[PDB]
Each structure stands twice: as structure tokens, then as C-alpha cells.
Amino acid sequence: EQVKLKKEISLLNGVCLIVGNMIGSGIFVSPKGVLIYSASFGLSLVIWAVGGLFSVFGALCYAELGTTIKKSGASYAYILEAFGGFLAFIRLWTSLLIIEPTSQAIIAITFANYMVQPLFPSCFAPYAASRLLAAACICLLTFINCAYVKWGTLVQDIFTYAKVLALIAVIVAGIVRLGQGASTHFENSFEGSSFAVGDIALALYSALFSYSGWDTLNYVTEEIKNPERNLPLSIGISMPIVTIIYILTNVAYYTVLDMRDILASDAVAVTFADQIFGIFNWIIPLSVALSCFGGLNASIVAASRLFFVGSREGHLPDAICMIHVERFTPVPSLLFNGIMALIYLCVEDIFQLINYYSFSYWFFVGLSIVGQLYLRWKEPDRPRPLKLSVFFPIVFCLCTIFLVAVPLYSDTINSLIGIAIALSGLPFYFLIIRVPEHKRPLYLRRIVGSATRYLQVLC
Ligand SMILES: N[C@@H](CCCC[NH3+])C(=O)O
Numbered sequence: 001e002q003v004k005l006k007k008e009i010s011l012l013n014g015v016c017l018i019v020g021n022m023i024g025s026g027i028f029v030s031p032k033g034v035l036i037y038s039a040s041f042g043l044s045l046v047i048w049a050v051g052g053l054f055s056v057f058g059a060l061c062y063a064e065l066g067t068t069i070k071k072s073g074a075s076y077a078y079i080l081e082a083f084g085g086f087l088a089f090i091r092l093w094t095s096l097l098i099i100e101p102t103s104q105a106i107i108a109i110t111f112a113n114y115m116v117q118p119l120f121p122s123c124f125a126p127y128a129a130s131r132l133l134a135a136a137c138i139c140l141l142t143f144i145n146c147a148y149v150k151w152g153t154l155v156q157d158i159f160t161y162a163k164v165l166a167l168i169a170v171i172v173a174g175i176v177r178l179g180q181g182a183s184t185h186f187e188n189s190f191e192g193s194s195f196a197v198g199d200i201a202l203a204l205y206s207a208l209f210s211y212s213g214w215d216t217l218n219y220v221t222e223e224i225k226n227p228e229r230n231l232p233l234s235i236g237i238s239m240p241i242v243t244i245i246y247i248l249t250n251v252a253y254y255t256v257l258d259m260r261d262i263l264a265s266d267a268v269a270v271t272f273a274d275q276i277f278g279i280f281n282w283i284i285p286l287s288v289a290l291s292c293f294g295g296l297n298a299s300i301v302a303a304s305r306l307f308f309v310g311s312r313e314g315h316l317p318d319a320i321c322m323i324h325v326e327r328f329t330p331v332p333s334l335l336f337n338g339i340m341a342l343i344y345l346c347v348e349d350i351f352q353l354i355n356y357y358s359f360s361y362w363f364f365v366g367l368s369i370v371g372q373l374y375l376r377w378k379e380p381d382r383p384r385p386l387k388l389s390v391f392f393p394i395v396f397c398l399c400t401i402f403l404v405a406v407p408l409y410s411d412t413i414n415s416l417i418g419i420a421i422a423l424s425g426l427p428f429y430f431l432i433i434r435v436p437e438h439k440r441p442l443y444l445r446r447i448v449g450s451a452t453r454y455l456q457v458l459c
Contacts, residue, residue, distance in 0.1 A: 051207025082371025174252020
């Protein structure tokens with residue numbers, strides 16, 4: 001009965017946090033980032049499959065890591081127990097300022113856009129709506145996750161079911177248009193491609209960037225029923241599902257659209273629909289909005305638990321490690337994440353904020369893998385229920401080196417401002433965190449007063 005974040009995330013709610021968070025407005029809108037560089041369908045599908053394989057290697061690394069550690073945080077519990085503190089600190093701080101607020105605000109804006117879109121198919125949706133609809137979405141998901149976490153897993157479940165239904169719809173349309181005929185785009189000179197170290201590297205980067213989120217279940221891993229089984233099994237059931245969904249929906253696309261109008265189109269699914277569904281060409285913008293809703297709910301669960309864990313370790317203020325008394329949901333962490341996402345709804349060029357945290361994000365996943373190897377070396381006696389091999393940590397450490405080098409020479413000043421964000425986090429750690437609580441002024445008294453006032457949100 002004691003205040004503890006009860007588990008209540010089954011295997012199904014495990015597969016829905018990963019699949020949900022993963023397939024979101026990635027293959028729905030301009031997924032041709034792997035087609036611009038691999039200028040052919042055959043090479044495009046080969047690079048989809050290869051990026052999927054390498055994301056599977058990363059997800060198996062994280063299954064082993066999350067069954068080894070059994071602490072939520074998913075990049076912050078694996079840097080904190082392998083390395084120490086400071087690096088974990090600037091992983092919560094990068095996720096606190098730039099990574100999680102921006103990603104949630106962008107998913108909210110992209111949900112608003114494609115909710116409104118069937119009304120404004122050619123005209124661009126206004127900036128007044130498509131930001132107020134985004135704030136309504138963020139606030140609704142924060143409230144749904146703040147009331148009952150079973151509600152939050154339910155929302156995630158429903159909208160992941162919607163995602164998979166819509167993508168099965170487009171995949172079925174593609175297979176139909178392939179069986180009846182219409183196989184000109186496919187299997188005929190399929191690979192008049194652009195084999196080149198630059199182009200192949202950038203297409204692999206775009207694919208491996210498109211399967212992100214495989215580490216979403218690891219954020220909520222103190223709340224899984226028997227994590228030892230349900231975390232690796234849910235990851236290993238989610239990753240082939242999402243890889244298959246990706247390569248099949250791209251097959252469909254290529255079968256219907258063409259190399260020309262599949263580029264130079266804003267949201268290629270909303271092009272595919274216009275070519276096939278006809279009068280029901282609004283279903284696909286509706287499904288992009290639903291998939292963005294599922295992805296936003298998963299981002300909110302994961303970010304709320306990242307900040308909760310971060311404050312439980314002493315990094316974020318105590319007020320953020322607090323459960324609700326009767327509902328058992330991290331109310332102050334969720335309010336904080338919602339505050340941050342809504343603040344980042346006021347920014348105009350947020351899709352420009354993407355790239356800083358892009359480099360930093362893959363850096364931190366890499367540092368977590370490096371920490372897994374550090375633990376394999378230093379403590380080869382910790383109970384690891386699922387210990388696969390070293391081959392997967394090694395290959396995905398290499399793939400992380402690649403995914404970190406690509407945005408460091410392509411656009412370097414942005415990644416430098418990302419490192420600047422982490423450096424800006426540094427002073428709080430070297431001046432507030434590392435203080436042993438008995439050197440701070442009556443700022444402590446203010447902090448405790450505020451923490452009590454916010455304790456008056458659980459009662
Ligand atoms: N992978 C999702 C984004 C969620 C990953 C977490 N930042 C996408 O492809 O759009």
C-alpha cells in the first residue's frame with residue numbers, strides 16, 4: 001500500500017510503448033530521407049532492412065541493459081550505474097532543456113497539423129490553431145497520464161492499434177496494387193541506384209534515425225510486470241514488427257507512387273492516399289494525427305519517468321520524485337514535463353531545434369552502450385538474466401560512432417551548440433548537485449516551502 005509506482009505495464013502495454021513511440025509520423029510523412037540519398041527503390045528497401053537490423057542490434061543491447069539494471073531512466077540509469085553522476089547529469093539536463101520538450105512539442109504540432117489538414121489540403125494551416133490544438137493535445141495527455149497510469153497505457157494501446165491498422169491499410173493497398181499489376185516501378189531496373197560512400201552512409205543514417213524509440217520501454221522499467229521477462233520479450237516482439245511495418249509500407253509506397261512524386265511531396269502517405277483511396281483520402285491524415293497522438297503519449301510517459309528517476313537520484317529537485325497518494329502517478333514530474341513542452345510550443349522554428357538534440361541524443365545512446373561494455377568488463381558477476389553476447393554491444397557501439405560522426409561533419413555548428421547545451425547544464429552539477437545539502441543557504445528553505453506547496457497536489 002506504501003506509495004510506490006505500481007507495475008501494471010503488461011507485455012501488451014510493453015509492445016505498445018515501443019511500437020507506438022517508434023512508428024510515429026516517420027513513415028507517414030516524408031520518409032524519403034533514405035530515398036533522396038539511395039536514389040532507387042531497390043537500394044532504398046535494402047537500406048530500410050539494414051537500418052532495421054542495426055536498430056535491432058541496439059534494441060537487444062538495451063534489452064540486456066534493462067534486464068541487467070532494472071532501474072528506470074533508460075539512458076540515465078545506464079550512464080549513472082556504469083559511469084557516474086556528471087555524465088548521467090548532463091543526460092538529464094540535455095533531455096530536460098532541449099530533447100524531450102522539443103520532441104513532445106514537435107509531435108504535438110505535427111498532430112495538430114494533420115488533424116486540421118483535411119480542411120486545408122492545399123492551404124497551410126494557420127499558426128493560431130496548430131499551436132493551440134497542440135497545447136490542447138499536450139495538456140490532455142499530461143492529464144490522462146497524471147490521473148491514472150492505467151489510463152495512459154490504455155491511450156497508448158488504443159492509438160498504437162490505430163497506427164498499426166493504418167499502416168496495415170497502406171501495406172495491403174500496396175500488395176494489392178502489386179498483385180493485380182502496376183509493377184512498373186518495382187522489379188524493373190529496380191536498382192539504378194547511387195552506390196557511394198557518402199550517399200550510402202547518409203541513407204543508412206536516415207534509416208537508423210527513423211527507427212528511434214526502441215529504448216522507450218526502458219524509460220518505464222521499474223513499472224513492468226516481472227521486467228526480466230517482459231522487457232526483453234516486449235522489445236524483441238516490437239522490433240521485428242516495426243521493421244516489417246517499415247519495409248512493407250515503403251514497398252507499398254513505391255508500388256503506388258513514383259520516384260519523382262514520392263520526393264517533392266510534403267507528406268508522402270497523404271500523397272499515397274490521394275492516389276489510391278480517392279474519396280477516402282482523409283483517412284491517412286487522420287491516421288497521421290492518431291499516430292502522433294500515440295507517439296506523444298509514449299513520449300510523455302517516458303519523459304515523466306526520466307525526470308522522476310532523475311530527481312530520485314538527487315539531480316532534479318525533490319518535488320519531482322513524488323508519487324500521487326491514491327492514483328500512484330508522478331504528478332509533479334508530469335506537470336513539469338507538460339510545462340516544458342508548452343513553453344517549447346511558443347518557439348517558432350522548433351523543427352530547426354531538431355538537429356542540436358539529434359547529435360546529442362545519439363551521443364547519449366552511444367554512451368549508454370559504452371557503459372554496458374564498461375559493466376561487462378568491470379562487474380562480470382552482476383545477475384544478468386538475459387546476457388546475449390558482446391557482439392551486439394560492439395556492433396551497435398560502432399553504429400553509434402557512425403551516427404554520431406555523421407552529424408558532426410555534416411553540420412558541425414549545430415552539434416557544437418548542442419555540446420553548448422550540455423556545458424550549460426554543467427554549472428548546476430558542479431555548484432548545486434555536488435554540494436552535500438549542508439552548504440546551501442535559505443534557498444533550501446524556499447525549496448522546501450515550494451516542495452510542500454507542490455506536495456499539495458497529491459492530497
Ligand atoms: N522514432 C520516432 C520518434 C520517437 C523517438 C524518440 N525521440 C520517429 O521516427 O518519429
